[PDB]
Amino acid sequence: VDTCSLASPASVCRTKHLHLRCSVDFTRRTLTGTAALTVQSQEDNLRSLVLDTKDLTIEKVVINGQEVKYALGERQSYKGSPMEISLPIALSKNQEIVIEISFETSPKSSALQWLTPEQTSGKEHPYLFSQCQAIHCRAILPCQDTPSVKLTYTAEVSVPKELVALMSAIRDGETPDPEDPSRKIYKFIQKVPIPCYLIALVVGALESRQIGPRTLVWSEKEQVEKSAYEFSETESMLKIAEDLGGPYVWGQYDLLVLPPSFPYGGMENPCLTFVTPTLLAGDKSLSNVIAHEISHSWTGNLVTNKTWDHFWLNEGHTVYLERHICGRLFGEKFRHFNALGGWGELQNSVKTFGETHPFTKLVVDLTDIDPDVAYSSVPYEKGFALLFYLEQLLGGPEIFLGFLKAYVEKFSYKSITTDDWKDFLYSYFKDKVDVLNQVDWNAWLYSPGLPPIKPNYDMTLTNACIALSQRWITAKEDDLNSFNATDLKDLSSHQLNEFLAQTLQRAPLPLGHIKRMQEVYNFNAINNSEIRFRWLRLCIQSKWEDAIPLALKMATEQGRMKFTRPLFKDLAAFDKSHDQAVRTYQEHKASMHPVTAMLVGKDLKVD
Ligand SMILES: N[C@@H](CC(=O)O)Cn1nnc(-c2ccc(Oc3ncc(Cl)cc3F)cc2)n1
Ligand SMILES: [Yb+3]
Ligand SMILES: [Yb+3]
Ligand SMILES: [Yb+3]
Ligand SMILES: [Zn+2]
């Protein structure tokens, strides 16, 4: 059962198609229009159905050209309000009907961020973007807001003519709006069935540059050139991902570089991956995020988790595929380095929640839990650790990659549970069932904390990071003069980041050590968002007051939650910056992404 949805489940009825016709009004901060749902009954004598909605204004519901009775139930917190539709005629099993719902979004839709021109690069035009994952599609349109249901979609979007609309679909033309010549209509088609959290929309002053045979990069004009360079390896990654997962079925693989308030590193929207502008390091060093989003074209978008309790199926397999792409491009020692880094991020998450916390379990129970509050590195890294452990136990990467491809083939276009995955693993590895029966499944899948077994990792690229970090941690005041810019000469940006991660795990360090690190390494000058984030966290946790304006600036000038949430939390925990952290959040709250605003609010205990 999907405990995050209030809609009729897949066993009652299934949405087969959505035909969306809407208009974006920037003055009212509203999306208005019709969502035409092609619903197939899965039951005999079906006379009503329930849809998920959240802060939607419903005008009418039309079936067979006539208005039908509908009712909106009491709001159930983050789940929204259930919408019961009275069908005009009882439906037999497998019978299909079209339900056209006239709706309007609230300006406070948790799925959307409305940007004023001042909040964009260009400063002349407003901007809109959606983020439906996990359960925010119900805050845009009435739907069965569950990944257990997959549907195709077509969309027609009216926007002011000076702007461009894009969706998680194939672009299907543009025309002047026949109802308003100050507007344009942008058309879209998604022929591959998808869960509704993969529905996405962006409206802004967008420009494009071709960077591959099936890839355009999209952003405001100011970011196009930098984005084209940063993501130039995209086609190479797609070719490797196809070799590992089978055919790319989505047609196009475009990239959209969002404004800095985009709350995640990326979003695997089909045909149009969304990315944070914090990836624009200038040297392609944060491109693993692209490898991760590309990998989702197989794991997550083709093979989907049936409910959000099984989310690890989505991320664990994606991180696994992502690390193989980087492994093919830069070698097996690099894949091991990234895997070990991943284990360290898992240690961090387990330490933050506490080793007995229910969110440290691989398979979770989201009954009465807002998925946004549960979000962490655990399904990513505990999920990856399991697969990497299975890879070693079952004979190596080549053998395990054979399983990955067969798993994708077996479950493409379906929504599955952990039991479905485990059953297939046992079927594929029938000749190694004795090895599989040695796995402590109850601990790996259902127990909190660190996994019962840690995999084996090649140390070649990690050794220099640990050695430098340990030199700083063990150093006394009279050893600080020995550090010099030459200590970093043989370290890649990835190794610099790992050195900071290792040191941050032992934070605080004495204030004199942090001051010396800046003196000799000039970390303040580094623009790479990952390195800068860890360096600022290290400064704040080591109580360096000079870092307060830098940390406040980074936390607010961008909104990627991975950075913004721990920076605000570190600033709130430092006595010297506590008041500034709270006040800065209060003054920025209204201009923030709604999900980021909620979570920073909870982290700071500011209601
Ligand atoms: N897809 C990513 C980027 C990427 O990985 O490529 C972007 N992204 N956007 N939203 C989310 C997201 C995912 C799960 C959420 O909820 C849950 N979190 C943990 C568990 Cl165990 C179960 C849940 F349901 C809430 C939000 N992820
Ligand atoms: Yb066409
Ligand atoms: Yb079985
Ligand atoms: Yb000494
Ligand atoms: Zn992912």
From Swiss-Prot:
Positions modified as N6-acetyllysine? 69, 333, 410, 569
Q: How is its activity regulated?
A: Inhibited by bestatin. The epoxide hydrolase activity is restrained by suicide inactivation that involves binding of LTA4 to Tyr-375. 4-(4-benzylphenyl)thiazol-2-amine (ARM1) selectively inhibits the epoxide hydrolase activity.
The UniProt-reported impact of residue 560 to A/K/M is: Abolishes epoxide hydrolase activity. Reduced aminopeptidase activity
Active site, UniProt feature: 293 (proton acceptor), 380 (proton donor)
Q: Which GO terms describe its cellular component?
A: cytosol; extracellular exosome; extracellular region; ficolin-1-rich granule lumen; nucleoplasm; nucleus; tertiary granule lumen
Residues carrying the site annotation Covalently modified during suicide inhibition by leukotrienes? 375
Substitution effect: residue 136 to Q? Aminopeptidase activity almost absent, but keeps LTA4 activity
Q: Which reaction does it catalyse?
A: leukotriene A4 + H2O = leukotriene B4; (5S,6S)-epoxy-(18R)-hydroxy-(7E,9E,11Z,14Z,16E)-eicosapentaenoate + H2O = resolvin E1; (5S,6S)-epoxy-(18S)-hydroxy-(7E,9E,11Z,14Z,16E)-eicosapentaenoate + H2O = 18S-resolvin E1; Release of the N-terminal residue from a tripeptide
Q: Which residues carry this modification: Phosphoserine?
A: 412
- Known tissue expression: Isoform 1 and isoform 2 are expressed in monocytes, lymphocytes, neutrophils, reticulocytes, platelets and fibroblasts.
Residues the record marks as site: Pro-Gly-Pro binding = 268, 559
Identify the residues that bind Zn(2+).
292, 296, 315
Please give the family membership noted in the entry: Belongs to the peptidase M1 family.
Protein name, as recorded: Leukotriene A-4 hydrolase
Give the encoding gene's name: LTA4H
